[PDB]
Design a binder for this molecule. Structure first.
Ligand code: AGS
Length: 267
């Protein structure tokens, strides 16, 4: 609420409160009364335009699965603290946390797809998210997912498709492509790059040569296998989302409906 609040809430930015740091922000945990926050300390015109883009999105649009801006000062942005961390960290079991069970994994994918579906259709101009990734998906105390990072958003590089890298093109289908790779991480528990090939290339090669049921062998070993058709629907959906040709990718609306029927077969 005040900046004085952030100094006290961090014991003046003591290291005990430092969460981490990226390219644009230094990030601290802040305790203000009986709520916990993460403050992203704005640390180059490129940097600046990405700060504005983050502010623009979060001040105008709101969704249960988008991490909301609570306050800002101007230089910093304050968000509610997400105690279960990033999807990436949980898939990689950072800190020796237990692997996520399938019903949470599919719930995470559904929530994020709703957030993207909402952003792709907000009343004035639609929003292309631009930085969809397992790192930018945060998780609350019940593993409800929260989409974050709109520094690359636009109104209409492992996660980026060819037509973006090669020709600068950007669309609704950009987010679908990135989301497809996230599904691949969620199914396998692998990083986007493997110990040195890309997860997307490995799964696409396997699906073309050996069909959808052969990916069963790449399901995350740290849980018992999900049902066969759950796996096949999700690998299929991931492969289509990550297609090289944008025209082959489903809309996020169709993705959401597919994810939701996939969840039903789990129950
Ligand atoms: N609301 C939050 N709750 C918990 N951890 C958070 C929150 N916001 C940021 N973090 C973490 O703080 C650390 C640093 O954040 P980053 O996302 O790397 O910052 P950034 O400067 O926006 O990043 P870019 O993408 O590299 S510009 C990461 O480990 C994040 O997961």
């Amino acid at each position: 609420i005040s900046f004085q609040n952030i100094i006290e809430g961090t014991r003046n930015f003591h290291k005990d409160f430092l969460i981490g740091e990226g390219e644009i922000f230094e990030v601290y945990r802040v305790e203000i009364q009986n709520l916990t926050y993460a403050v992203k300390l704005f640390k180059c015109k490129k940097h600046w335009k990405r700060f504005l883009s983050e502010l623009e999105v979060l001040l105008l649009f709101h969704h249960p699965n988008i991490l909301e801006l609570a306050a800002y000062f101007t230089f910093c942005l304050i968000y509610p603290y997400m105690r279960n961390g990033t999807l990436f960290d949980r898939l990689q079991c950072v800190g020796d946390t237990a692997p996520l069970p399938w019903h949470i994994r599919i719930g995470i994918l559904i929530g994020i797809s709703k957030a993207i579906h909402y952003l792709h259709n907000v009343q004035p101009c639609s929003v292309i998210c631009g930085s969809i990734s397992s790192a930018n998906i945060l998780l609350d105390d019940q593993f409800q997912p929260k989409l974050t990072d709109f520094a690359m958003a636009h109104f209409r590089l492992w996660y980026m498709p060819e037509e973006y890298i090669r020709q600068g093109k950007l669309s609704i289908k950009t987010d679908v492509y990135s989301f497809g790779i996230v599904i691949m991480e969620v199914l396998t528990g692998c990083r986007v790059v493997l110990d040195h090939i890309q997860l997307r290339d490995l799964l696409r090669e396997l699906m073309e040569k050996r069909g959808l049921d052969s990916c069963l062998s790449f399901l995350d070993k740290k849980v018992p296998p999900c049902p066969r058709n759950f796996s096949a629907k999700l690998f299929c959906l991931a492969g289509r989302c990550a297609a090289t040709r944008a025209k082959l990718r489903p809309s996020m609306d169709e993705v959401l409906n597919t994810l939701e029927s996939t969840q039903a077969s789990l129950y």
